[PDB]
Scaffold this active site. Structure first.
Site, PDB file in Angstrom:
ATOM      1  N   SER A   1      46.694  70.419  23.322  1.00 41.70           N
ATOM      2  CA  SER A   1      46.029  71.668  23.240  1.00 41.70           C
ATOM      3  C   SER A   1      46.727  72.732  24.137  1.00 41.70           C
ATOM      4  O   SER A   1      47.110  72.450  25.314  1.00 41.70           O
ATOM      5  CB  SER A   1      44.579  71.533  23.726  1.00 41.70           C
ATOM      6  OG  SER A   1      43.682  71.225  22.652  1.00 41.70           O
ATOM      7  N   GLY A   2      46.745  73.948  23.617  1.00 47.42           N
ATOM      8  CA  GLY A   2      47.279  75.093  24.340  1.00 47.42           C
ATOM      9  C   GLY A   2      48.756  75.252  24.097  1.00 47.42           C
ATOM     10  O   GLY A   2      49.300  76.327  24.421  1.00 47.42           O
TER      11      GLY A   2
ATOM     12  N   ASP B   1      40.652  81.245  19.699  1.00 48.12           N
ATOM     13  CA  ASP B   1      40.917  80.273  20.770  1.00 48.12           C
ATOM     14  C   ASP B   1      42.302  80.593  21.431  1.00 48.12           C
ATOM     15  O   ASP B   1      43.313  79.967  21.121  1.00 48.12           O
ATOM     16  CB  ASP B   1      40.958  78.911  20.178  1.00 48.12           C
ATOM     17  CG  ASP B   1      40.982  77.815  21.232  1.00 48.12           C
ATOM     18  OD1 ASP B   1      40.844  78.069  22.459  1.00 48.12           O
ATOM     19  OD2 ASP B   1      41.229  76.630  20.874  1.00 48.12           O
TER      20      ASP B   1
ATOM     21  N   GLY C   1      45.634  66.279  24.682  1.00 45.08           N
ATOM     22  CA  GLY C   1      46.638  66.523  25.674  1.00 45.08           C
ATOM     23  C   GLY C   1      47.664  67.529  25.184  1.00 45.08           C
ATOM     24  O   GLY C   1      48.463  68.097  25.987  1.00 45.08           O
TER      25      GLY C   1
ATOM     26  N   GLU D   1      59.476  71.468  33.408  1.00 43.38           N
ATOM     27  CA  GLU D   1      59.258  70.019  33.505  1.00 43.38           C
ATOM     28  C   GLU D   1      59.866  69.327  32.282  1.00 43.38           C
ATOM     29  O   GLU D   1      59.653  69.710  31.194  1.00 43.38           O
ATOM     30  CB  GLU D   1      57.780  69.707  33.566  1.00 43.38           C
ATOM     31  CG  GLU D   1      57.091  70.305  34.759  1.00 43.38           C
ATOM     32  CD  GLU D   1      56.221  69.328  35.475  1.00 43.38           C
ATOM     33  OE1 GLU D   1      56.785  68.479  36.083  1.00 43.38           O
ATOM     34  OE2 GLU D   1      55.008  69.405  35.323  1.00 43.38           O
TER      35      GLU D   1
ATOM     36  N   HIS E   1      39.978  77.147  25.089  1.00 41.14           N
ATOM     37  CA  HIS E   1      39.190  75.970  25.400  1.00 41.14           C
ATOM     38  C   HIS E   1      39.761  75.197  26.556  1.00 41.14           C
ATOM     39  O   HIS E   1      39.104  74.282  27.103  1.00 41.14           O
ATOM     40  CB  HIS E   1      38.924  75.095  24.145  1.00 41.14           C
ATOM     41  CG  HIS E   1      40.081  74.304  23.706  1.00 41.14           C
ATOM     42  ND1 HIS E   1      40.930  74.717  22.677  1.00 41.14           N
ATOM     43  CD2 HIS E   1      40.471  73.077  24.052  1.00 41.14           C
ATOM     44  CE1 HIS E   1      41.847  73.802  22.521  1.00 41.14           C
ATOM     45  NE2 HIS E   1      41.620  72.813  23.365  1.00 41.14           N
TER      46      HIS E   1
END
Ligand SMILES: *[C@]1(O)O[C@H](CO)[C@@H](O[C@]2(O)O[C@H](CO)[C@@H](O)[C@H](O)[C@H]2NC(C)=O)[C@H](O)[C@H]1NC(C)=O
Lengths: 62, 223
Positions: free
Chosen positions: B177-178, B84, B175, B52, B40
């Protein structure tokens, strides 16, 4: 172009509470109320939860 | 992440940020040139940011690499979020070092009760918005399948797992997600969806990575 909140899955509670289930991506949108919402699904959920009828002014952040 | 803590520097070297002008999703580095994230999170162009610590500052010790190939699972369903999962091939290999390292794919599915680490730059509040610059961490257990299905009746497929706390208060959020859910050094979940964040009886839902190792290997082998 407005938006389609049907695009997101919803579920009904025991007492009839409709809950919109949202993905966790950060894709901010700017509401017709001038508030920036984390993503479109969250704006959809806000309208349902508050009973408002805010639309999407534009896909970015206000 | 709601209710978590600031991760120590270099604690989560496999965490990446997906950027298309600004951070929009997380992801996990699995080898020198491949990242796993959520379908998504798909966008046509994506810059992967690695190493980072603070996403708002450039310290020189990060690496910014454009995606060359973006492959979403062929059976992904954009409406239910089943399947997903997405693979991103980096334009060039990342240089691995103390700040940029990989995480292992799972050798077997995680059992209910296993303790995992969730990380991300997502919202830290349940009601309202507050985006951290520094990567947040949260330890949470994998819930049972029956427990997950009872929190979201008819919405949980065999490719989904719940991880979190039924009492609410701690969860992944917009923020995130993934991003990764790593248990005993193995990537077992991808941050996917939920009813809001940190709500009682509504733990976060995550893609069940152990179902996809063969597909990952086949895809990578051929690309
Ligand atoms: C909630 O109930 O989910 C369903 C499923 O998406 C929504 O139902 C649909 O999508 O509503 C649209 C018109 O808005 C209609 O064209 C679709 O056929 C219909 N699908 C079904 C299966 O009925 C429903 O609107 C939504 N509820 C809210 C308030 O968002």
């Amino acid at each position: 172009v407005p938006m389609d909140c049907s695009r997101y899955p919803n579920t009904t509670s025991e007492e009839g509470k409709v809950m919109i289930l949202c993905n966790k991506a950060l894709n901010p949108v700017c509401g017709t109320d001038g508030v920036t919402y984390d993503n479109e699904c969250v704006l959809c959920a806000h309208n349902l939860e508050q009973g408002t009828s805010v639309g999407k002014k534009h896909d970015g952040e206000c | 992440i709601v209710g978590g803590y600031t991760c120590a520097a270099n604690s989560i070297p496999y965490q990446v940020s997906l950027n298309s002008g600004s951070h929009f999703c997380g992801g996990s580095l699995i080898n020198s040139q491949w990242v796993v994230s959520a379908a998504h999170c798909y966008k046509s162009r994506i810059q992967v940011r690695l190493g980072e610590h603070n996403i708002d500052v450039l310290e020189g010790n990060e690496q910014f690499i454009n995606a060359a190939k973006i492959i979403t699972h062929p059976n992904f369903n954009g409406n239910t979020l089943d399947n997903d999962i997405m693979l991103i091939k980096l334009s060039s290999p990342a240089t691995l070092n103390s700040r940029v390292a990989t995480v292992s794919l799972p050798r077997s599915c995680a059992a209910a009760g296993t303790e995992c680490l969730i990380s991300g730059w997502g919202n830290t509040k349940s009601s309202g918005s507050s985006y951290p610059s520094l990567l947040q961490c949260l330890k949470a257990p994998v819930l049972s399948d029956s427990s997950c299905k009872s929190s979201y009746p008819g919405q949980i497929t065999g490719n989904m797992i719940c991880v979190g706390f039924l009492e609410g208060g701690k969860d992944s959020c917009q923020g995130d997600s993934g991003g990764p859910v790593v248990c005993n050094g193995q990537l077992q979940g991808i941050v996917s969806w939920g009813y809001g964040c940190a709500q009682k009886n509504k733990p976060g839902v995550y893609t069940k990575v152990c179902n996809y190792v063969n597909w990952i290997q086949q895809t990578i082998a051929a690309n």
